[PDB]
Structures are given as structure tokens and as C-alpha cells.
């Protein structure tokens, strides 16, 4: 409603670096808000794509940002009559970033890993890795829970059970208020999908450079399964957290599986022990139901509500014809211990191939009316197909079925404006929560400031 579409702020990165693929707000020890941006195709040292991370200070003008420097050198360690190898070429550092306290978590879901023992090997596979930084102090650490030292032959013998070689850990990420990093790995367990949790503080204290393979005792991975419904479901494509059990001491996990049960797609709510509470099933196949999940209380009953994106949903139209436009589902949490029923609201896109639902960001209370609001992206929607971000306001009965404001892309065609979103943070300190939008196609980030309601 009251986002300023006239005087934007533009941050920009190198050409072809995909600057804006992922972003988040970052507060330092003094509460001064900044913006962390991931550029998963930034050139490394060897003139090869490795990705990179930038930490933009807040300036109404915008501009270039300083880099958040990470180690981009391939590593090798000969130990235990084995050779451990990491390959950071084309790893996509910055394909997801997330902030919590004065710490940044930037991940490279396609960092490759291999172990050599004489003539055998573990196979060079993308286990994924995340890099952690404390910008003020300069502390650094890494976390890669799917790294293993089991040779290729053993996996064949034990029939690929517990195969964490293709995790791509860091694909999606989130951090609980208690400080527990939760990585999504859609490729764990041979493209079944796993989740990996570990306290941030334990990551920093149990990391030393050059070790490559080290233990984190407080970590907790999910479990393999022999159920064909989870086969090629990419459990962990998107991840989020919230409160869905009634107990305020436990933190619950929301996981997307957009190809679950033969591309039916699903979303599952779990406890911190990965035990399944509820399971929302997809409505239409290949709709990619679960591509994005968001958690916020939209109806103001203190109970977190759930939002699920299915950006390929094909809407039914006249003459038995379908039209891919995308769709978003709203689930309102019921009072007390009860299952989440049917969707409370269906928001369906309008622009063909617009992918309405590719990204969903809680905005907090934008117009300051008592209900939290959200923003939904259609990165190839709008009358020009350049991209659109629609805002939907909260109300006593859920959400409004029609948008209050629509942000058209200021970038050229193909910018993927809206592919990443983040809101609910006041960055100019005017009392109103703001919105940052990424357009990796144009390698820029646009900041929309919320202003008093006209």
C-alpha cells in the first residue's frame, strides 16, 4: 500500500555476477542495518566463476558495495592414508544468504568434494558448503555436514543408503531466534532431501582451517527413508521456521518438497527432532508446490500462519484450456492442537509464464493497521513480462484477495525482478518496515522505502 515506488535506491554489482540472487538485512552490534547480497557467479582469483558476497551500507543513493571476503582457494589435505579435496569452481557462493545477530551465513550449494584412497575415490560430487562471517571482528568459519570419507564402492554395496554425496547443503537456509542454523539440502540421500541443523556458536568453536573433515557434536541431520513418495522430491528446496505446536520452548521447521510423490509436491511441518506434524499436499503436478515457504501471523491471532508458493500452477480457463500463471496458498493455524485444514485463500497469478509465487516475503505491518502483510513476486509477470511484486494486506479473516500495491520492474527485460525478497526491517529508521528486491538478471538490488499512508 504505502511503499514508495517513485524514489527507489539501487545497489549494483559486477556484470554477469548474478548480484541479487539472494539477500537479507544485517544488523551489526550497534543495530545499524545493512544489506547482504549474494552473487553466485562472481569471478574468483583464477578468473573463474566462484561466487561472492557483498555487504552494502545503507545509503539512499545506493551504488557499489564492498566485498565480504572469503577463502576461494581449492583445498587439499593428505591424512589417514587418504586425500581430501575441495573444489570451489562454479560453487555458487551467495546462492543463499541469511543473517542472525552480527553473523552472516553465505552458502555455496554446488561446492564439490572428493576423497582419494590409492585408486578408489568417493566421486567428485556437490556436497555443498556454507561460509560464516562476523564482519566487525573478522572471524570466519565453514560448515559442510554432508562431507564424508566413504569410498564409492561401499555406497554401491550398502545400496546407496545414507548417501550424502550430492547434498548441495546451503541450497536454502534459515536461522532460528535461538541461533540454530538450518540448511536445506535437496540432494541428500540420493535426491531424497535432508535438513541439517547446528548451533552457530558451536560451528565457530569447532572449526579450524585446513581440517576439511571435522565433527560438530551438537548437529542434527534428518533421516533417510525407503518410501518412494520421497524419491526425487528435493526435500529441502525451501525452508522456514515458526511456532505450530503450541509449545513456545520448541522451534518447528517448515520444509518444501516441490517434486514430492511424483512431482505432486508437498510441504511438511516438523519438530526440532524432524518428526512430522502436518503435511500439506500439492494441488497439481509439476506446479512445484513448495518452491517457496514463508511464515508470519497475518490475521493477528499470535499464531503463525503458513504460505506456500506453487509458481508453475496452471489455472483452468475457458474451452478446457490451461494457463501457467502461478498460485499462492494461505494456511491459517487453528486455535490449539488441531491440524491445518484446507487453504484459507487462493491467490492466483494473471500473467502467463509469470511464475506468481516464486518468492514470498513477510513484510511485517506495512500500513501499521495491526495485521502483518506479505509480498509475492511474479518475476516474469506484469503486462510487459518484466516482473512484478504484489503486496497483500492482512485482515481479521486472513488476507485480502486483491493486492493493495503493485511494484513494476524498473529493470530491463529478463532481470528476474522479484526472484528474491526480504522485508519486515526498518532500514531508514522512520518507523515503517521496508522491502528489498533482487534482480540478478540485471545484477542490481532495489530498495523500496515505506512511507506514511497517503
Amino acid at each position: 500500500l504505502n511503499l514508495d515506488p517513485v524514489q527507489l535506491t539501487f545497489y549494483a554489482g559486477p556484470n554477469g555476477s548474478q548480484f541479487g540472487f539472494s539477500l537479507d538485512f544485517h544488523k551489526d552490534s550497534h543495530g545499524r542495518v545493512a544489506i547482504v547480497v549474494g552473487a553466485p557467479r562472481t569471478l574468483g582469483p583464477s578468473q573463474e566463476e566462484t561466487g561472492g558476497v557483498f555487504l552494502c551500507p545503507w545509503r539512499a543513493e545506493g551504488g557499489q558495495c564492498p566485498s565480504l571476503l572469503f577463502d576461494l582457494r581449492d583445498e587439499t589435505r593428505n591424512v589417514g592414508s587418504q586425500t581430501l579435496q575441495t573444489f570451489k569452481a562454479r560453487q555458487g557462493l551467495g546462492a543463499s544468504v541469511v543473517s542472525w545477530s552480527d553473523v552472516i551465513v553465505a552458502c555455496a550449494p554446488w561446492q564439490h568434494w572428493n576423497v582419494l584412497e590409492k585408486t578408489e575415490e568417493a566421486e567428485k560430487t556437490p556436497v555443498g558448503s556454507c561460509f560464516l562471517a562476523q564482519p566487525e571482528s573478522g572471524r570466519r568459519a565453514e560448515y559442510s555436514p554432508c562431507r564424508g570419507n566413504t569410498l564409492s564402492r561401499i555406497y554401491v554395496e550398502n545400496d546407496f543408503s545414507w548417501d550424502k554425496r550430492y547434498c548441495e547443503a546451503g541450497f536454502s537456509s534459515v536461522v532460528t531466534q535461538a541461533g540454530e542454523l538450518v540448511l536445506g539440502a535437496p540432494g541428500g540421500y540420493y535426491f531424497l532431501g535432508l535438513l541439517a541443523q547446528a548451533p552457530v556458536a558451536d560451528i565457530f568453536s569447532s572449526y579450524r582451517p585446513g581440517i576439511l573433515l571435522w565433527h560438530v557434536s551438537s548437529q542434527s541431520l534428518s533421516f533417510d527413508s525407503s518410501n518412494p513418495e520421497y524419491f526425487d522430491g528435493y526435500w529441502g528446496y525451501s525452508v522456514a521456521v515458526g511456532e505450530f505446536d503450541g509449545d513456545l520452548n520448541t522451534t518447528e521447521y517448515v520444509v518444501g518438497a516441490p517434486t514430492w510423490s511424483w512431482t505432486l509436491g508437498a510441504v511438511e511441518i516438523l519438530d526440532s527432532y524432524y518428526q512430522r506434524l502436518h503435511r500439506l499436499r500439492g494441488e497439481q503436478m509439476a506446479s512445484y508446490f513448495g518452491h517457496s515457504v514463508a511464515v508470519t501471523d497475518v490475521n493477528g491471532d499470535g499464531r503463525h500462519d503458513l504460505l506456500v508458493g506453487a509458481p508453475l500452477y496452471m489455472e483452468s480457463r475457458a474451452d478446457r484450456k490451461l494457463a501457467e500463471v502461478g498460485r499462492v496458498y494461505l494456511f491459517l493455524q487453528p486455535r490449539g492442537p488441531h491440524a491445518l485444514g484446507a487453504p484459507s485463500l487462493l491467490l492466483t497469478g494473471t500473467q502467463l509464464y509469470g511464475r506468481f509465487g516464486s518468492a514470498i516475503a513477510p513484510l511485517g505491518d506495512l500500513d501499521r493497521d495491526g495485521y502483518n502483510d506479505i509480498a509475492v513476486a511474479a518475476p516474469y509477470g506484469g503486462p510487459s513480462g518484466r516482473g512484478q511484486v504484489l503486496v497483500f494486506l492482512g485482515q481479521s479473516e486472513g488476507l485480502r484477495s486483491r493486492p493493495s500495491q503493485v511494484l513494476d520492474s524498473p529493470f530491463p527485460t529478463g532481470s528476474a525482478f522479484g526472484f528474491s525478497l526480504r522485508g519486515a526491517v526498518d532500514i531508514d529508521d522512520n518507523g515503517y518496515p521496508d522491502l528489498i528486491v533482487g534482480a540478478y538478471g540485471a545484477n542490481q538490488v532495489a530498495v523500496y522505502r515505506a512511507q506514511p499512508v497517503v
Partner: antibody
Amino acid sequence: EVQLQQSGAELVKPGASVKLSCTASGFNIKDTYVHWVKQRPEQGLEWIGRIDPANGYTKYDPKFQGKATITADTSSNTAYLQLSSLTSEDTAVYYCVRPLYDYYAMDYWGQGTSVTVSS
Amino acid sequence: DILMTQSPSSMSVSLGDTVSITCHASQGISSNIGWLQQKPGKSFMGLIYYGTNLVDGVPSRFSGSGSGADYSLTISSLDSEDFADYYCVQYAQLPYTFGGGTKLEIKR
């Protein structure tokens, strides 16, 4: 806290067999590797072998092939070392070891089990 | 196997002295070395892993260093508890092999 609580001292005859234990306290034995080390005053320290309790796979120094047999039961959170066809030279103190952070290190040590072979 | 030559076999020193134990290997091990302590008539405690990194709970007066095949354990300002045995162990290759040992003794 991490603590490895081994079995009590054993007193056995040559040619017989003995089976030592190493119970985990404050954690899961399945978490890391488990090594066994032999200590004598003259010969110093010697490395026997290791086991991954998650799957049972083991590695041994060629010197102990035949006498040492390492196993583990995730149920009782305990690891075992079996010695067969005992000898006067098998009279030594036996420790179990696990690493702290590095997958391959030797950091935490049990109190040790005192073995004496004698007729 | 890899031979761990630890030297000296023993040394007589006093409280507050800065002493240095060394460990020489039969081949490069690239900082894949650890350090151990066995107080008289007791078990072992970890000190160093991966050449330089301290084990949780160990004081900062200890320190490891060296590369290739030559490494060094150094104790700045000895304490009354620091009089015990000290062994180096390599894990660059299986089987793991230890040093002969080094006993710190009170000088008088």
C-alpha cells in the same frame, strides 16, 4: 562432558582370550572413530586399530592382525577389543581413543585397562 | 610405516622455564601431528591436534608449531602440573605411529 569409562583390570592365562570394553559417557559412541592403543614401558606406545561404530568397518596395524579384534554395539554405546592367544608380551595397558574435532585425531582417552598374562 | 623420532628423551628444568620438545618424522606429514600428556600414574590428555590447534580446556602457555617433517611443542613458563610425559603422534598415514616419549623432570 566426554568421558570414556573402560573395563577393570584383567588377569588371565596365556593362550586364553580376553575382551575389553570402552563405554561412552555423555555422548553417542556412534559419533566418531574409536581407536585402541597399547602401552608398554619399553616398547612405548603402539597403535592397534580403529572402528567406525556407525557401520562396523575397521582398520588394523599389520602387527596385530590375528590377535586384536575390534567390535562395537551401538545399543550399549560400548566398543570392544578382543585379544586372542595371549602371551607374556601381551601384558600391557590398553586405552581407547576418539578425536575431538578432527576426524582423524587422537584427543580423548579412557583411563586404561591393565592386562596381566601369567601362568 | 612412518617413524616418529622424538627428542630429547628427558630434560631437567625448573618452574618458569621455556622449554621446547621436538619431533622428527621419516617423511612429510603436513601438520598431521598431535601432542599428548600423561601425568604420573594416570591416563592421557589431548594437547594439540593438526600441528598447532589447542584442545578445549588446555591452557594457552602450550603451543605447537613446525611443518614438513619437523615439529615443536613449546611450554612458556612451566607450571608444577606440567611435569609429566609427552608423546607425539602422527596420523598422516595408517598405521598411526607414536614417538618414544619425553619426560619433564624437576631440576635441582
